[PDB]
Amino acid sequence: KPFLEDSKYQNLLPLFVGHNMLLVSEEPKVKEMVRILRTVPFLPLLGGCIDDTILSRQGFINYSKLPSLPLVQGELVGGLTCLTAQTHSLLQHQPLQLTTLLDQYIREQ
Amino acid sequence: AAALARLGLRPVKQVRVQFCPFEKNVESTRTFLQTVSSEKVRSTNLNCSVIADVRHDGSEPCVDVLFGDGHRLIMRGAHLTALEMLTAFASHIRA
Amino acid sequence: PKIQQLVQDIASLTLLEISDLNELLKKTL
Amino acid sequence: KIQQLVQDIASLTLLEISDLNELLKKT
Amino acid sequence: PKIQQLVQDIASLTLLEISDLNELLKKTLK
Amino acid sequence: PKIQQLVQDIASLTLLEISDLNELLKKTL
Amino acid sequence: EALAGAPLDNAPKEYPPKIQQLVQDIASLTLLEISDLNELLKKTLK
Amino acid sequence: PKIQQLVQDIASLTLLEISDLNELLKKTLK
C-alpha cells in the first residue's frame, strides 16, 4: 500500500483488498492463463496492467482475442497511404470502366 | 468458514458472486467469496458450482444462490457485512 | 470522335471485334 | 479501324468519358 | 492552389494525360 | 494543363483537402 | 501522474491529448513530407 | 517537424495505442 500510494499506479489500490496475488510475465501471454482459469470458475481475474496501461478482465479478454502486433504495424502504413491509393484508384477506374463495360457487353451479346 | 464447513452445502446447487473490483464497496462480497470457495466447504458436495463473474462496469455488488427446490437467495453486499451474509446464507441452507 | 458513334460502335459491332477493342485498351491504359 | 476507335476514347476528356458510359447504360 | 481548379484540370486532361498522371503520382509516393 | 504541375499541386495539398478532391470528382464523373 | 485508465465500460474510447497532436500534424503536413515518412516506415518494417 | 522522429514515435507506441490510430484516421478521412 505505501509503495503505490505515492506512485503512477495509484489506480490499482482498490484492487488490493483481502487476499491477493500478482501473475507476472515479461511478455503478455494472456490466452493460456485465461484458458486454464476457465477450468476453475471460482477464481476471479480482478484486473492488472499491461504495457504501462491498466486493464480490467473485460479488457483482458478483448486483448486475448486481439491479433498480434506486426500485422497492425504494417496496416498502419496502408491506412496512411489509403488516401493516395483511393485517388489513384479513382484515376484508374474511368478508363477501366470502359473495358469492364465492353467485357460485360461480350456476355450480353 | 469453519461454521459453514460443519453445515454442508447440501440443498444449494449453484452459487454466483458478482462484484466490481474498482468499486470501494465490494470488499465484503470479496470476503464472502474467500469463505465460500474453500475445500472445507466445497468438498461437502460436488453438486455445488461456484462461479465468480467479476465485471468492470459500474453496478451494485450482489451474490446469487440457487437451491434444489424453489428457494432462491439473492443479496446485495454493498452495505452488508461478510459475517452477516454468511449467517443469513447458513440460515437459508438450514431451511 | 463524337460520343454518339462510339456507343453505337460498341453495340452494333460483333463479339470478336469488341474483344479486339479490350486488348488494345489494356496496353494503352 | 479498330486502333482508330481505341485512340478516340483514349483522347477523349473525362467529361466526355462520363457521357459515354451513361449513354451505354441507357441502351 | 484551389480544390475547384484541380478538379476541372483533371477532367480536362485526356486518358493518356491521366495515364502519365498515374505513373508520376505513384512514383512520388511509392 | 501540365501533368507535372498538377502532380506537384496534389503533393503539396493537405490530407483534408485531398478528401475534398475525390468527392467533387465522383459527383462530376 | 497516474494512468487513470478504464473510466467506464461504456466509455466511447476517450483518448489522451498526447495521442491527438500527432494526428493533426500528419494531416496538415503535405504528401511530400508523408512520402518520406512512408519510405522510412517501410525501411524499418514491412 | 522532423521526418525521422515521427517514425520512431509510431513504432514506440504499443498495440493498444496504435489501435486507436487506425480508427482515428477512419473518422477523420473518408
Distance from CA of A47 to the nearest CA of H (A): 16
In a domain, B30, yes or no: yes
Which residue of chain G has the CA closest to A71? G46
CA-based end-to-end distance of chain D: 23
Between A53, A73, A76, which is nearest H16 by CB?
A: A53
Residue C26's identity, in one-letter code, is K
- Count of other CB atoms within 10 angstroms of residue F23: 11
Task: Using the CB atoms, write b or e for D1-27: b if 16+ within 10 Å.
Answer: eeeebbbbbbebbbebbbbbeeebeee
Angle at the Cα of A97 (from A92 to A100), degrees rounded to 5?
Answer: 120
In a domain, B81, yes or no: yes
Rounded CA gap, B63 and B51, in Å?
10
Largest CA distance in chain F: 25
Between chains, do G45 and A80 touch, taking CB under 8 Å as contact?
no
Instruction: Answer yes or no: are the C-beta atoms of G3 and A8 closer than 8 Å.
Output: yes
Instruction: Answer yes or no: are the C-beta atoms of F29 and D19 closer than 8 Å.
Output: no
Rounded CA gap, A81 and A75, in Å?
10
Residue F1's identity, in one-letter code, is P
Residue C11's identity, in one-letter code, is A
Closest C-alpha to B22, from A20, A52, A1, A46: A46
Rg value, chain F, Cα: 10
Q: What is the CATH number of the domain that holds B24?
A: 3.40.30.10
- Cell of residue F29, nine digits: 464523373
Please report, for chain C, how many H helices and E strands are present, in that order: 2, 0
Which residue of chain F has the CA closest to G29? F14
Closest C-alpha to C20, from E19, D12, D6, D20: D6
Give how far the C-alpha of residue E10 lies from the chain's centroid of Cα atoms, to the nearest Å: 5
Chain D residues in contact with E20 (beta carbon < 8 A): none
Which residue of chain G has the CA closest to A53? G3
Residue H16's identity, in one-letter code, is L
Instruction: Answer yes or no: are the C-beta atoms of F28 and E4 closer than 8 Å.
Output: no
- Cell of residue B59, nine digits: 453496478
- Cell of residue E29, nine digits: 509516393
**Dihedral of alpha carbons H9, H10, H14, H18, sign:** positive
In a domain, B74, yes or no: yes
Instruction: Answer yes or no: are the C-beta atoms of A50 and B65 closer than 8 Å.
Output: no
In a domain, B95, yes or no: yes
Phi-psi region of A2 (alpha: psi -120 to 50; beta: other; left: phi over 0): alpha
Rounded CA gap, A108 and A100, in Å?
13
Closest C-alpha to B29, from B49, B53, B2: B53
Closest C-alpha to G4, from D1, D22, B45, A53: A53
Chain E residues in contact with G39 (beta carbon < 8 A): 30
Which residue of chain H has the CA closest to A62? H16
Rounded CA gap, E26 and E5, in Å?
22
- Count of other CB atoms within 10 angstroms of residue B39: 8
Cβ burial, residue B65 (10 Å; 0-12/13-18/19+): buried
Any residues with CB less than 8 A from the CB of H4 and at least 6 apart, and which?
Answer: G40
Total domain count, chain B: 1
Between chains, do B56 and G9 touch, taking CB under 8 Å as contact?
yes
Cross-strand partners of A54: A49
Query: For testing the chain F interface, which of G22, G23, G31 should be mutated: the one with the most F CBs within 10 Å?
Result: G31
Q: How many CA atoms lie within 13 A of E16 on its CB side?
A: 8
Closest C-alpha to F24, from A87, E21, D11, G24: A87
Chain G residues in contact with H12 (beta carbon < 8 A): none
In a domain, B1, yes or no: no
In a domain, B5, yes or no: no
- Residue B44 is part of which domain span? 12-95
Q: Report the relative pairing of strands A48-50 and B72-75 from DSSP bridges.
A: unpaired
- Cell of residue G36, nine digits: 518520406
Rounded CA gap, A72 and A76, in Å?
6
Residue A96's identity, in one-letter code, is L
Any residues with CB less than 8 A from the CB of F18 and at least 6 apart, and which?
Answer: A83, A84, A87, F10, G31
In a domain, B65, yes or no: yes
Between chains, do F9 and E13 touch, taking CB under 8 Å as contact?
no
Instruction: Answer yes or no: are the C-beta atoms of B56 and A57 closer than 8 Å.
Output: yes
Q: How many CB pairs under 8 A join A and F?
A: 13
Rg value, chain H, Cα: 11
**Dihedral of alpha carbons B75, B80, B84, B85, sign:** positive
Between chains, do C25 and A103 touch, taking CB under 8 Å as contact?
no
Rounded CA gap, B19 and B77, in Å?
9
Rounded CA gap, C2 and H29, in Å?
38
Task: Using the CB atoms, write b or e for B10-31: b if 16+ within 10 Å.
Answer: ebbeebbbbbbbbbebbbbbbb
Rounded CA gap, B19 and A41, in Å?
14
In a domain, B18, yes or no: yes
Closest C-alpha to G38, from F17, H11, H7: H7
